[PDB]
Amino acid sequence: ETTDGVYRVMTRRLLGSTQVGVGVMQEGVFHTMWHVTKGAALRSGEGRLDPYWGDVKQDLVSYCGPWKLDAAWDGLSEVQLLAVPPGERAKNIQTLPGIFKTKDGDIGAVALDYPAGTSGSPILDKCGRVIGLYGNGVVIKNGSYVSAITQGKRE
Amino acid sequence: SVDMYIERAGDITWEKDAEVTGNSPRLDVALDESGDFSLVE
Numbered sequence: 518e519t520t521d522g523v524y525r526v527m528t529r530r531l532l533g534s535t536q537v538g539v540g541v542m543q544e545g546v547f548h549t550m551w552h553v554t555k556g557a558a559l560r561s562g563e564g565r566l567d568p569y570w571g572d573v574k575q576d577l578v579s580y581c582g583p584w585k586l587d588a589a590w591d592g593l594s595e596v597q598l599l600a601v602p603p604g605e606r607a608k609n610i611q612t613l614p615g616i617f618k619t620k621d622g623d624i625g626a627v628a629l630d631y632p633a634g635t636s637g638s639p640i641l642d643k644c645g646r647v648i649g650l651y652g653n654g655v656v657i658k659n660g661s662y663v664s665a666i667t668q669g670k671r672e
Numbered sequence: 673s674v675d676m677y678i679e680r681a682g683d684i685t686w687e688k689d690a691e692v693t694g695n696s697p698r699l700d701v702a703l704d705e706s707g708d709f710s711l712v713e
């Protein structure tokens with residue numbers, strides 16, 4: 518129920534399902550963006566995953582244990598979004614990040630535009646390590662999208 | 673209540689010889705205490 522990999526986050530009531538996001542299972546912990554689950558518990562098969570750590574400002578939440586993803590964008594190299602869009606199989610998109618310049622420093626950012634339910638898809642370095650999650654971003658003047666490469670702290 | 677659940681969707685693997693794309697924008701942004709980014713204009 519916690520096998521390593523990328524997962525869709527789905528909701529259903531009485532009718533069909535909706536994909537609200539995506540996340541990463543690593544080292545027994547499930548990692549997604551806070552806005553996907555709002556910190557609610559997750560079903561995994563017959564099991565229940567409870568939120569362990571989260572932070573609204575970083576827009577991140579981990580389940581079953583503390584945040585495990587610690588790889589960082591090197592500030593130089595191309596990256597891959599492993600996009601898991603609603604209704605489509607996972608696909609890798611390579612890009613050279615831009616930069617969100619903030620008063621607290623620079624954050625890598627990817628100019629790649631996918632449906633809202635792609636939120637939580639992992640962004641990878643060339644070793645396949647997850648350097649952050651896709652889906653907290655901004656809309657620029659022409660209506661296109663730029664996502665921060667959002668990474669947590671592994672304590 | 674709403675059934676929020678997960679389902680496996682793949683292995684996490686860098687793809688060699690991948691489609692490379694998108695630009696590299698240099699944006700001035702602010703981050704508020706609700707986790708929302710906005711453009712500084």
Ligand SMILES: N=C(N)N[C@@H]1CCCCNC(=O)[C@H](Cc2cccc(CN)c2)NC(=O)[C@H](CCCCN)NC(=O)Cc2cccc(c2)CNC(=O)CNC1=O
Nearest residue numbers: 552576631632633636652653654655660661662707708709
């Ligand atoms: N608008 C374009 N071109 N592309 C986006 C791509 C979305 C990728 C996944 N991320 C999200 O859904 C988050 C949710 C979200 C929303 C609010 C707060 C948080 C948590 N801090 C998270 N979202 C975003 O970051 C952005 C910027 C957020 C700025 C702070 N509030 N929010 C939007 O894009 C809204 C939007 C604006 C204009 C048109 C459309 C949607 C219509 N597009 C779609 O209906 C599918 N595409 C789209 O929605």
